[PDB]
Symmetry: D2
Subunit: 198 residues, 4 copies
């Protein structure tokens, strides 16, 4: 079974950028809903798998992808943020971003464009392509996890569901996007980059 | 060509079930953004169709369905809501909700369950199947409209995008559902049934 | 594990309607490919499920839906056909078709229209809706199984992939559709209807 | 407005790798059906756009992308095939296939694997990413064209719909793949690279 992990900071440590009412809620409600549904569904999968029931397996695919991706997606999201966040990353990570996007600001503009373009619920991502050996930007719908659905390795993600900035920025998604860069834990993004730089 | 329709009531006429902020933001900011972007899209479309560009016609599709449906979907919504609605309809429409869904009991439950079940942004609909002559409950993702995508005639629709209840009801989608049944304009729901009960 | 079931007739028992070169091939090659992939994938599912790996689970969803649906779909397909097929069904099944589609020929025209309209690979289906208590016609893409993906109970299906009539009818799909009605095992379609008439 | 382009060679010029029947049927029956239905669709489109009908514009979309892309996809295909092609390209394009995919060895393998992997009807593509200035291997479902759906510039495309190899190669898709490499017009593949190597 899975569990809800604690945050590496407080519910209000991301203020004024990300409201505390949003943070506690995004964690305790939304993210918590995900892990339980994930556990219930996973067991309903074990029931039909041993049973040899393919119809049941297939019927359980959407719930499993939604709650499972919700789990995976948000878990990586928390570690991407930090009260000691913002600025430009350093070392090899910044060189890769330069080698692949020209500069840090060109990279910023694009991840902003891809996240602001998601119609309905989705996520903006910065991923490492293990095969071609370079960084890519991708957008995923609802809770579809980046790696499970694309093979790209998730370095940095931006939750652009309306429950992630509405209480604060309302229908204005670019304001939230302008702000998110000030709480980004580049320590972690580099950390995830070293693991797959293999 | 397309105009933001005026609400047939004041921004706070549906209070307490839907607070005045949500209606103002929904109508003014969201619905309006669809009209404005639909206009630019159809204009960009005449341009590509005119100079036989099929790659541009295809690339423009996502935006047209999104903004086009956003405008279609919300204009309906405003007419389905009303200060003096709620409860139950009057025989003919009720006579139908009866026969096709058991009773208003199970009809509410059916629509509530379709709406609550949407993963991410979407809508729950009570439509009319003009072939079969039967009522149907259909859920559309994002801003995909009933008719254009499924062929069903829209009678009553419930927006379940998070911008429709988050400020008030927050994370509890089902709370937004039990409360919406109060502002439902059964008079208008009936109006759509009649023009198609043929 | 799963296996390839034998046909309730010979590879040429459906001539002149369905070629024998098509029949043996559709079974021994296409259908056989499905069951093995189904078994390999199912075990790769058990590996990651016990491991608690959600990324792997999600990555294996498409193969599992395609080979699993391919298995389910074709298995029902064989029992739908018969050298002693064709004509109109009798008893309750025909009354239901009349009560839901007006007549047998109106039903025929529609299942023909839905199967001839599939763009790319897909299946035409006649299903029983357990909840609304009546027959419906639906079309599914590639190998997506009807019940697992819609809840409808599969009574009769028409494989409209190009590997199902090309050697014989070439790009002409309606000819194959005109012919398929002459080998339809209505004994079985009624049989599947009794089970869900519950 | 749209015309069925004439083949730049005889229906049997690519023999023995693609037999004369397949080319005749592909070009004459399939490709033609797309042109004819694309024309009727765009005409139906001007009509709905003209009288501000957004429901009809949306309902017409599936057909436009299907026939529109069918015409786009095949017209390319004919120019990518040729009596005297095969082997390897000449430096500039080869210089690129080298850098981005390792070597022609792994480039063939990469495209072959993308094509063989399609579930149902589709295409494998070698495109140009005009931002990154890099070559990319992309697979499109049904008749969804590269550019209109992904933004990549199409350089070389392999049809994997069953009507492209079934009469000859039958169920063995990979046999059709190893054989197609022989008729590949590297001269034309180069032609598309040049106009975009900017
Ligand atoms: Mn979230
Ligand atoms: Mn809305
Ligand atoms: Mn088949
Ligand atoms: Mn083709």
């Amino acid at each position: 079974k899975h569990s809800l992990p604690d945050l590496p900071y407080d519910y209000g440590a991301l203020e004024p950028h990300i409201n505390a009412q949003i943070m506690q809620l995004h964690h305790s409600k939304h993210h918590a809903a995900f892990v339980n549904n994930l556990n219930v569904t996973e067991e309903k999968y074990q029931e039909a798998l041993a049973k040899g029931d393919v119809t049941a397996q297939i019927a359980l695919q959407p719930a499993l992808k939604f709650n499972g991706g919700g789990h995976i997606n948000h878990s990586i999201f928390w570690t991407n943020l930090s009260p000691n966040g913002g600025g430009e990353p350093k070392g090899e990570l910044l060189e890769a971003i330069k080698r692949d996007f020209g500069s840090f600001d060109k990279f910023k503009e694009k991840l902003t464009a891809a996240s602001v373009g998601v119609q309905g619920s989705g996520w903006g991502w910065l991923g490492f392509n293990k095969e071609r050996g370079h960084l890519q930007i991708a957008a995923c719908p609802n809770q579809d996890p980046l790696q499970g659905t694309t093979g790209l390795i998730p370095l940095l993600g931006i939750d652009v569901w309306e429950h992630a900035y509405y209480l604060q920025y309302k229908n204005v998604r670019p304001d939230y996007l302008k702000a998110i860069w000030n709480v980004i834990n580049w320590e972690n993004v580099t950390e995830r980059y070293m693991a797959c730089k293999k």
